[PDB]
Design a protein around this ligand. Structure first.
Ligand SMILES: CC1(C)S[C@@H]2[C@H](NC(=O)[C@@H](N)c3ccccc3)C(=O)N2[C@H]1C(=O)O
Ligand SMILES: CC1(C)S[C@@H]2[C@H](NC(=O)[C@@H](N)c3ccccc3)C(=O)N2[C@H]1C(=O)O
Ligand SMILES: CC1(C)S[C@@H]2[C@H](NC(=O)[C@@H](N)c3ccccc3)C(=O)N2[C@H]1C(=O)O
Ligand SMILES: [Fe+2]
Ligand SMILES: [Fe+2]
Ligand SMILES: [Fe+2]
Lengths: 288, 288, 288
C-alpha cells in the first residue's frame, strides 16, 4: 500500500471520475482530503475571525448569554484558580437551537454551517453511491440528519486516539505558526500527518459509514499530538469539526452489523441508532 | 456578576423570602449553601464518628460482611501489594437494601440518611416552585425517588471536573486540619473555593434540575483539588455526598431537552430517564 | 480468611467433590484456578505459536486482510510516528464471523476456541449448580451465549482496576521470562499475585454470575501491573482471555439485581441484559 492520504475533487467524483480509486480509498483508508466542495479558506478565515474575537474579547456576561445551562458542548460557548477555558474554548452549533453572540456572528456562522452541512451531505452521497448503498428509508431521509459543528481554539496528547461515530466528519484546521502538524491518523498501520491544506477539507469516515455500507468503508483511528518544546512556541491551533450524525431512528440489520465488527448486544434482526448507542449522542469511541 | 457563592436559609425560602435572589442564583450559578435545613454539624460528627471507627478499626471479616458482591459503591463498604482502600474508603446507603455493621451504626445512619433525604426533597421543592415547574406526574411523585448517599474518607486532582446528573446534590464536608480547600466549582468562568461551613450544607444543582425546569437551572462543573506539599501534611478529608436522583420512569419532553443543551438521540416526543441514561444510574458526567 | 487463591479440578467438582469449599470460594473470593478442564499448556503453546508468528512476521497486507473496518477488537487483528501496535497487538475470535490469516491458523484457533468455550460452559454449569441457580429460560439456553476470545501480546499499570461483566472469564497466560507477576486481584482486601500455572486456567467470576445467582458469587476486582526497571528486561507477556458473555435476551429480576448491589435504573420487574448494558457489549467496568 501507498500510505499517502489521497485527495479527491468533489466535483470530479460527482461526474463519475476516479470511481475505483475512491472506492479503494474508502475500504483501505477511510480518509481523504476533498477539494471543489464549496469550502474556501476565505470563509474559514471569516467565521474563524469573528469567533476568535468573541473568545478573546467577549465579556463574562456575553459568554454567559450564549452558554447552555448544562455544559454539553452542544450549542454555544464552552470555556474548556483559573478556568476550564485555560486549556481551550469551544463554539458549537447545529441546524437549530443555536446561541449566537450577535446578528453579525449569526449571519456569518449560519452561512458557514450551511456550507459545511451541504458539503458533508454531498460527500456522503458519494460514499453511498460508490458502495452501492441504499440506507433503509432511502438516501435523502438518511442524510437529513443531526449534524453538529464544533470549533475549538487550543492555546499553546491533546486528543487521545479514537474513531468517530459519524457517517462522515469534515475537518478544517488552521496551521500552527511554527509548522507543527498536530492531527494524525493511522494509515497502513502507522501514524500519518494530516496537515492543513488551504484548498481542501479533511474527511474522516466514521463508524456509521462502516455500518450503513455493510463494512465497505473503514473508520480510521486518529489523535491530536502535542509539540516537543523546540515546537511549543507558536503551538496554538484551531479546528472546525463537522459531524454528520444519523437520526435516532436510522435503522440497520443486526446480523450485518455483527459481520463488520460491531460487538452489538441487540436482540432480533433490525435496530435503530438509538437502540445501539442509547439516548445521548456519542461522537467518538476508543478501541480500549 | 458577583461570583460569590450565596447562602440561603431553607426556612426563609419556604416563607417566600429572597425569591429573585434564589431564582437568579439557580439560573446563573446553580449552587449555593443552605442553612436552616435540619443538618447540624453535631449529627454530621455523630455519623462521621461511627463510620470512621468502622473504617479504621473494623476487621476484614466485618468489612466483608457489609461489602456487596459486585463492587458498585451502591450499598455498604467499598475499600477504594496493598489495597484499593489505600487511596480512599466509602460507605453507601439508600432508602433500602442497606448493609449496616451493627445496630448502633444502623440507628445513627438511618436517622442521618433520613435528615439528608428530607432536606434534599425540601430544597428541590423550592427549586421547582421558584421556576414554576410541575414535573410530569406531579411534584411529590417526582421527589419520592432513588437517592444515594456516599460518605468518602480520603487519606493524606482527586476528582476530575464534572457536573452531577442528579436533581440536586447535598454535600457535607469535614475540613482539612491544615486549612486547604479541596472542593472547587466554576462560578463566573473561574474556579471558586467551596469550603466547609459548620452551619450549612452545599447544594449543587444537577442536570436533572436543568432538564425538568426547561433550562432555568444551571448544573455547574466542579472538581476536587489536591494540595501543594506545603499543604500535604494534614490534607486528609471526608465528604458526605447525597444524590437526589429521579425514578427510571421520570418523563420529560424531548424537544424541550434539546432546547437546553441536551444532545439527545431520542426518537419521538417524550422520553424517560431510563431512555436517556440507560439501565444503570450514572451519577456524574464530564464535558469531554 | 485464608487469602489463598484456591485451585479446583473441574473433573472433581463435576463428581460432587469439594461442594462447600467451592461454594465458599465463589461467595468470598470469586476467583480460582481450574485444572482437569481440557486446557493444556501444549495447546496454549500451539495457538500461541501460530499467532505470535503472525504478529511478528505477517505483512501489512496480510494484517489488513484480517482487520475489521471498525477498530472494535471483536474479530481479527488489532494493532494496538509509529503505530498503535507499538504498545500491544490483539487477535480476537468468536463462534462465527471470524477472520483467519490462513487455513492452518483457522484449524488451530478453531480447536483452541472450542476447548475454551467448552471449559467455560462447564465451569459455569458448576457455578450455577453450586448456588442452586436456574436462569430464566433454563441453563443450557443461558450458556449457549456470546463468547469472545482475545489474545493479547504485550511488549516489554498496563490495565486499570476493573471487574468483568461476564458470567465467567478464563485466562491463560504465558510467564514473563524474568519472573515478574503482572496479573493481580483483590483477595481479602489486598492485591494477590495471579501467576501462570502450566497445568491450570485462572477463572474470574464476572458480574453476570453475581446477577444470575442472586448475589451468591463475588465479581472481584483485578488489574495488570507493570515492572520496576530491575524487572523491565524480559517483561513482555501474553494472555488469552475468554469472556463467557450472556445473550442480549438474558432476563433477570430487577428487584433481585438491586438486592445485590446493582445500581439499576430499570422500570418494572424484569429486564434483559440489553436493557441493562445497552446495545453494545461492555466487557469490563471500573468501581469509579
Ligand atoms: C478528531 C476529531 C475529528 S473528532 C474530535 C473531537 N470531538 C468533539 O469535540 C465532539 N466530541 C463534540 C462536538 C460537540 C459537543 C461535544 C463534543 C474534536 O473536536 N476532534 C476532531 C479533531 O480534533 O479534528
Ligand atoms: C463532587 C460530588 C458532589 S459528586 C462526586 C462523587 N460521585 C460519587 O462518588 C458518586 N458517583 C457515587 C455514589 C454511589 C456509588 C458510586 C459512585 C463524589 O462523591 N463527589 C462529590 C464530592 O466530591 O463532593
Ligand atoms: C483482566 C482481564 C481478564 S479482562 C481484561 C481485558 N479486557 C479485554 O481486552 C476485553 N475488553 C475485550 C475483548 C474483545 C474486544 C475488546 C475488548 C483483557 O484482555 N484483560 C484480561 C486480562 O488482562 O487477563
Ligand atoms: Fe475524531
Ligand atoms: Fe459532583
Ligand atoms: Fe478483567
Amino acid at each position: 500500500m501507498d500510505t499517502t492520504v489521497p485527495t479527491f475533487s468533489l466535483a470530479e467524483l460527482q461526474q463519475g471520475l476516479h470511481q475505483d480509486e475512491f472506492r479503494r480509498c474508502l475500504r483501505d483508508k477511510g480518509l481523504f482530503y476533498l477539494t471543489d466542495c464549496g469550502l474556501t479558506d476565505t470563509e474559514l478565515k471569516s467565521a474563524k475571525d469573528l469567533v476568535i474575537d468573541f473568545f478573546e474579547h467577549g465579556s463574562e456576561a456575553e459568554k454567559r448569554a450564549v452558554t447552555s445551562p448544562v455544559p454539553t458542548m452542544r450549542r454555544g460557548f464552552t470555556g474548556l484558580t483559573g478556568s476550564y477555558s485555560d486549556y481551550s474554548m469551544c463554539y458549537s452549533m447545529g441546524t437549530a437551537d443555536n446561541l449566537f453572540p450577535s446578528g453579525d456572528f449569526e449571519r456569518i456562522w449560519t452561512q458557514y454551517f450551511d456550507r459545511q452541512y451541504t458539503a458533508s451531505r454531498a460527500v456522503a452521497r458519494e460514499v453511498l453511491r460508490a458502495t452501492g448503498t441504499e440506507p433503509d428509508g432511502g438516501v435523502e431521509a438518511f442524510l437529513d440528519c443531526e449534524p453538529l459543528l464544533r470549533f475549538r481554539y487550543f492555546p499553546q496528547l491533546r486528543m487521545a486516539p479514537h474513531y468517530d461515530l459519524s457517517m462522515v466528519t469534515l475537518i478544517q484546521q488552521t496551521p500552527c505558526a511554527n509548522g507543527f502538524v498536530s492531527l494524525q491518523a493511522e494509515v497502513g498501520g502507522a501514524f500519518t500527518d494530516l496537515p492543513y491544506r488551504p484548498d481542501a477539507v479533511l474527511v474522516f469516515c466514521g463508524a456509521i459509514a462502516t455500518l450503513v455500507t455493510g463494512g465497505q468503508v473503514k473508520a480510521p483511528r486518529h489523535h491530536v499530538a502535542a509539540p516537543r518544546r523546540d515546537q511549543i512556541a507558536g503551538s496554538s491551533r484551531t479546528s472546525s469539526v463537522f459531524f454528520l450524525r444519523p437520526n435516532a431512528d436510522f435503522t440497520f440489520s443486526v446480523p450485518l452489523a455483527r459481520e463488520c465488527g460491531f460487538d452489538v448486544s441487540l436482540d432480533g434482526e433490525t435496530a435503530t441508532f438509538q437502540d445501539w448507542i442509547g439516548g445521548n449522542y456519542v461522537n467518538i469511541r476508543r478501541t480500549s
